DNA sequence: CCCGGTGCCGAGGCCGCTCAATTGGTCGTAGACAGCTCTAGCACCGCTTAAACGCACGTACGCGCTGTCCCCCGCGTTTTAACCGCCAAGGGGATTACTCCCTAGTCTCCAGGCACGTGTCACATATATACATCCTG
DNA sequence: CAGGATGTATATATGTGACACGTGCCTGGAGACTAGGGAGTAATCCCCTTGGCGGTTAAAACGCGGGGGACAGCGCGTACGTGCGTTTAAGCGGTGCTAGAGCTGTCTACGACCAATTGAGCGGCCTCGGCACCGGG
């Protein structure tokens, strides 16, 4: 697909900032947040697809994502059975 | 002595809103695009595509970075768009194309009630004596998607070619079904 | 309550008496193994 | 309303709930976009996509929590791009 | 033809009900709880393995696990876990 | 044989000592595992679980809820001093965050 | 004992120079001393925890390396 | 004395292969040995984790390849994978 | 007769790597090509770092790799930097860099 | 900072021994591969509508400037101890002797993990007044 | 120093999702009971690497002075927030289809394993030369 990073709109980023405590947001903060989220997803999904291809599987399971997040340091509970 | 030919199609679609918008006075939506003629991944050799619009827009110089390259926008008048395709290899001269943004239908097409307006043209990018890297990129192009790839303009003719199958099958199915159901209920 | 008890006590009893006669075999083995340990003590005096 | 009251209201509202702040259908398409660049015709589980969205939201919440302090450090209430840039640099992502 | 997957939910609920008679737990909370158990199990076991490899020992023992717990758990949680483990290892070897 | 007693019951724990020992012995951790290692590991895990469950139940009662949800886990972890340090680099799904609004961004 | 003042103002200033600072505040030294004390306390606690299990009367650079690896501050140069 | 062991000889040989005239000091040699040991530990741990994930009781060349992919950044991964695959292919032919 | 290192064309000790893999508790069965592959990757990384440090020390009129130039290479190479990010090279120093704001003029 | 002289101890090359790597040979078992299937992922289309997009307006926050007051910065002289060598001896490690703990195998047996249906048992969504909780006067 | 005018709680309710609870299955586990292995505990004891003595200058420290940097006050401008209206595609759940993850069944090459042989590596030792140190340009 293409240009799906724009599926993270200004209201969504502003809610994500409200949940983080930010009160006032600038204009370019939305572009910065989109770029950072894209860079993070790139690495996470690269690790996930590396765990998938090695398993000769065609579906990216949740354990692959869990292992990718563990590698990146973002241990995630709730999806490990 | 190496010549590589890449077939592409560049054009624009337009949809009429049915009435002039009060917010900005625009009457049509339009999407301007470059896409490959073959089912191939342009991103293997295209770095970016820049589209230069008419000076009425807040920014006329738009950019796209992934195939099928396209921009969706709104307008009320026709103008010439300059599409500058840049290749990954900086030593290769980018291609320049001029597309006449068509938004209004002809009398013949207006009478036919067609829901969309399209203007697109076929071209072939010719790389003569390209660099080793550029040659490898052009030769290593992969398939874009597993699905079919198709062309639209003459939109009225393509729509008629589609309907010549669609309405035939629909009518056959409808009549056959009606006959089956009525005979079965009569018994 | 009591039906399962007898069935359990039977398997336990045959298990209990079982392990009893069992350590009995190990004990007799331990007597032959006791003589072998005395032989090992003789070998340890040899080594000293 | 005064600029800031309806914003502190939303702050207190979204620091109370736990639902996802990013829309599923738009985020799954971004996930499939980023996966296309690694494998063609790749399948994803709903649980995997939800875990990805949760990780992304938690990471962005932490990033904005750090950016808030980066902005307050300069006696500013609005977060600017250099704030997120300093956050990333001191985190070690773009040092 | 069944594909049965194991988990710690049967004992995580027993401990839950014994430390809180009136409070329950949802399925998502139970899954997060099992994930936490697995993560800390991996951490402590890997730390004990590292200690054994450093001491040039091919077997992990209660002492390696104790030092691993002391290293992992912080401050006033380390002491609690260590006292619990010590008391359990002494009530287990006493044939009770 | 005699009535078989499980190691978990013998020690006084609830977590599966047998499964912990199986994992330890077949895993990367070591060649062979002693009988005391899995008991200690299971006891420590059970203690951590009891602590975090107590905190989550307290948070649930505070929020007026009978079922512990990931909110009650996140709040408990980020309110506790030592559990926060233990799980600092761990994210919990649908757990949320704390209402920690900086004093500088309040009405003046 | 209280010999934490061994990390003096000139030493902290040279550390700041190496870190690229060209001007230090008046209250930076007492904060750097506490930060260094906490970092030490942690690393030395891990080292002593390793040494106790090792049953050695002497703390070793190997134990220091293990403590640093546990804290995430991997160090090269001392056999690890 | 004991027998502490290191890759010093092979590190020196690779140093001669890359720079025939540039030597290396003892501190640098020890640092390189420590780096090699740490990379070995990390790659082997990642391979064992991959084996445990795939429920394989063995660490194979494919596991090592995937562990190197999961650790080296980009071009470094692409070059190390090529080196490993070429080495294994040349080994299998003898 | 023939060492597996020379057989595969490598300089690193394929045999020592296999021994360390099978004795490090990493797995119950070490593949035939796993140690060869690991030794090849280690040799590649070692050659990279040694070449960089060599030509970093030779850039300073020296003819002997030192920790200073090892650190310089590790921190100037963007790949090796991401690799050894949280690693500290003893006696390596830091990179010469003064912020423009601190700089005069 | 760069250049020519001296100098020394640490780098690098040789000797020799041994213990790990290698060669040869066996068993078996995890795996590679084909066969079957049934779930779940994919695609699509319509009714509903909540969220998003665009624009207007002004209010308050960024940001630029200025001024004071001081709190570090550079330099000189004054005081403390870090640093570089000898000398016991206290420990870290070789060497030998030996036993409690675990391994391995084989039955016997308690226990938990689902397939299924049944009966309770939260709290999400909905509704409303009570309470703040503003903000323009 | 209020009050429309919003927004935010607070409490109550109910019925559909989900914990919660039998009913029997069994197969993977959990433990008991012999037999065999083995590595580390324990006691010495030889041998380096600590910890402890007296000097030497080099760095830490104390002071001084003024200078440039922090912090506060203030004002200009604009952009970021909020509200209203128009627009769009997001959520729902209803249907259709097949792709492959998964279970399964069979046959097999690869590696652990064990024993004997061989040379690669490593402690050790010595000779030597690359760079530490230094004083003039």
From Swiss-Prot, chain A:
Outcome of swapping residue 11 to R:
In TEBIVANED3; results in early developmental defects when expressed in zebrafish embryos
Point out residues bearing the modification N6-succinyllysine.
10, 56, 58, 70
Covalent cross-link Glycyl lysine isopeptide (Lys-Gly) (interchain with G-Cter in ubiquitin), where: 70
N-terminal signal peptide:
none
The entry's stated outcome for residue 19 to L is: In TEBIVANED4; results in early developmental defects when expressed in zebrafish embryos
Q: What is its main location?
A: nucleus
Where, per the database record, does this protein carry N6-(2-hydroxyisobutyryl)lysine?
Answer: 10, 23, 38, 56, 58, 70
Question: At what positions is N6-(beta-hydroxybutyryl)lysine found?
Answer: 10, 56, 70
The highest taxon in the source lineage is Eukaryota
Q: Which residues carry this modification: N6-acetyllysine?
A: 10, 70
Give the N6-glutaryllysine positions (modified residues).
Answer: 10, 38, 56, 58, 70
The entry's stated outcome for residue 77 to H is: In TEBIVANED3; results in early developmental defects when expressed in zebrafish embryos
The residues joined by the cross-link Glycyl lysine isopeptide (Lys-Gly) (interchain with G-Cter in SUMO2) are: 10, 38, 58, 70
Regarding protein family, the annotation reads: Belongs to the histone H4 family.
The record's subunit annotation is: The nucleosome is a histone octamer containing two molecules each of H2A, H2B, H3 and H4 assembled in one H3-H4 heterotetramer and two H2A-H2B heterodimers. The octamer wraps approximately 147 bp of DNA. Found in a co-chaperone complex with DNJC9, MCM2 and histone H3.3-H4 dimers. Within the complex, interacts with DNJC9 (via C-terminus); the interaction is direct. Interacts with NASP; NASP is a histone chaperone that stabilizes and maintains a soluble pool of Histone H3-H4 dimers.
Q: What is this protein called?
A: Histone H4
Q: Which organism is it from?
A: Homo sapiens (Human)
Source organism phylogeny:
Eukaryota, Metazoa, Chordata, Craniata, Vertebrata
Segment of the intact protein contained? 23 to 103 of 103
UniProtKB/Swiss-Prot annotation, chain B:
Per the UniProt entry, the effect of residue 26 to A is: Impaired binding to histone H3 succinylated at 'Lys-122' (H3K122succ)
Q: Name one GO biological process term.
A: regulation of transcription by RNA polymerase II
Q: Where is this chain's protein located in or outside the cell? A: Nucleus
Disulphide linkage map: none
- Nucleus among keywords: yes
* Annotated segments matching region Diacetylated histone H3 binding: 76-80
Where are the residues of the annotated region Interaction with MLLT10?
A: 146-187
- Tell me which domain of life the UniProt entry assigns to the organism this sequence originates from: Eukaryota
Per the record, the covalent cross-link Glycyl lysine isopeptide (Lys-Gly) (interchain with G-Cter in SUMO2) lies at 20
Which cellular component, as a GO term, is one annotated location?
nucleus
**Interaction with TACC1: where is this region?**
151-187
The molecular function terms of the Gene Ontology recorded here are: histone binding; histone H3K18ac reader activity; histone H3K27ac reader activity; structural constituent of cytoskeleton
Transcription regulation listed as a keyword: yes
Site (Interacts with diacetylated histone H3) location in chain? 56
Tissues in which the protein is found: Expressed in brain, heart, kidney, liver, lung, pancreas, placenta and skeletal muscle.
Query: Which UniProt keywords are listed?
Result: Chromatin regulator, Coiled coil, Growth regulation, Isopeptide bond, Nucleus, Transcription, Transcription regulation, Ubl conjugation
Entry remark concerning the domains of this protein = The YEATS domain specifically recognizes and binds acylated histones, with a preference for histone H3 diacetylated at 'Lys-14' and 'Lys-27' (H3K14ac and H3K27ac).
Q: What does this protein do, in the record's words?
A: Chromatin reader component of the NuA4 histone acetyltransferase (HAT) complex, a complex involved in transcriptional activation of select genes principally by acetylation of nucleosomal histones H4 and H2A. Specifically recognizes and binds acylated histone H3, with a preference for histone H3 diacetylated at 'Lys-18' and 'Lys-27' (H3K18ac and H3K27ac) or histone H3 diacetylated at 'Lys-14' and 'Lys-27' (H3K14ac and H3K27ac). Also able to recognize and bind crotonylated histone H3.
This chain belongs to the protein called YEATS domain-containing protein 4
| Residue range from the parent sequence | 18 to 204 of 227
From Swiss-Prot, chain E:
Grouped into one coarse class, the protein's main location is: nucleus
PTM sites of type Phosphoserine: 7
N6-(beta-hydroxybutyryl)lysine modified-residue sites: 5, 56, 87, 91
Q: Which residues carry this modification: Omega-N-methylarginine?
A: 57, 63
Tell me where in this chain the PTM N6-acetyllysine is found: 56
Identify residues that carry Dimethylated arginine: 50
Modification type N6-lactoyllysine: residues: 14, 56, 79, 87, 91
Q: From the Swiss-Prot or TrEMBL record, state where the protein is found.
A: Nucleus; Chromosome
Using the record's annotations, give every residue carrying the modification N6-crotonyllysine: 5
The record's account of how the chain is modified after translation = Monoubiquitination at Lys-5 (H2BK34Ub) by the MSL1/MSL2 dimer is required for histone H3 'Lys-4' (H3K4me) and 'Lys-79' (H3K79me) methylation and transcription activation at specific gene loci, such as HOXA9 and MEIS1 loci. Similarly, monoubiquitination at Lys-91 (H2BK120Ub) by the RNF20/40 complex gives a specific tag for epigenetic transcriptional activation and is also prerequisite for histone H3 'Lys-4' and 'Lys-79' methylation. It also functions cooperatively with the FACT dimer to stimulate elongation by RNA polymerase II. Phosphorylation at Ser-7 (H2BS36ph) by AMPK in response to stress promotes transcription.
**What keywords sit in the KW lines?**
Acetylation, ADP-ribosylation, Antibiotic, Antimicrobial, Chromosome, DNA-binding, Glycoprotein, Hydroxylation, Isopeptide bond, Methylation, Nucleosome core, Nucleus, Phosphoprotein, Ubl conjugation
Which residues carry the post-translational modification N6,N6,N6-trimethyllysine, per the record? 56
N6-succinyllysine found at: 5, 87, 91
Q: Where on the chain is PolyADP-ribosyl glutamic acid found, per UniProt?
A: 6
Q: Which residues carry this modification: N6-glutaryllysine?
A: 5, 14, 17, 79, 87, 91
N6-methyllysine modifications at: 17, 79
> Where N6-malonyllysine occurs along the chain?
87
One GO cellular component term noted in the UniProt record for this chain: nucleoplasm
Q: Which residues carry this modification: N6-(2-hydroxyisobutyryl)lysine?
A: 5, 14, 17, 28, 56, 79, 87, 91
Q: Where on the chain is N6-methylated lysine found, per UniProt?
A: 87
Q: Which residues carry this modification: Phosphothreonine?
A: 86
Glycosylated residues, per the record, are 83
Q: What is this protein called?
A: Histone H2B type 1-C/E/F/G/I
The source organism is Homo sapiens
The primary gene name is H2BC4
Q: Which residues of the full protein are shown?
A: 31 to 126 of 126
Swiss-Prot record, chain F:
Q: Determine if Nucleus is one of this entry's keywords.
A: yes
Modified after translation how? It is involved in the initiation of both imprinted and random X inactivation. Ubiquitinated H2A is enriched in inactive X chromosome chromatin. Ubiquitination of H2A functions downstream of methylation of 'Lys-27' of histone H3 (H3K27me). H2AK119Ub by RNF2/RING2 can also be induced by ultraviolet and may be involved in DNA repair.
Residues bearing N5-methylglutamine are: 94
Annotated localization: Nucleus; Chromosome
GO cellular component terms, alphabetically, are:
extracellular exosome; nucleoplasm; nucleosome; nucleus
GO molecular function list: DNA binding; protein heterodimerization activity; structural constituent of chromatin
Positions carrying N6-(beta-hydroxybutyryl)lysine: 3, 26, 85, 108
> So what does this one do?
Core component of nucleosome. Nucleosomes wrap and compact DNA into chromatin, limiting DNA accessibility to the cellular machineries which require DNA as a template. Histones thereby play a central role in transcription regulation, DNA repair, DNA replication and chromosomal stability. DNA accessibility is regulated via a complex set of post-translational modifications of histones, also called histone code, and nucleosome remodeling.
Instruction: Name the family the entry cites.
Output: Belongs to the histone H2A family.
Q: What is this protein called?
A: Histone H2A type 1-C
What organism does this protein naturally occur in?
Answer: Homo sapiens
Summarize which stretch of the complete protein this chain spans: 12 to 119 of 130
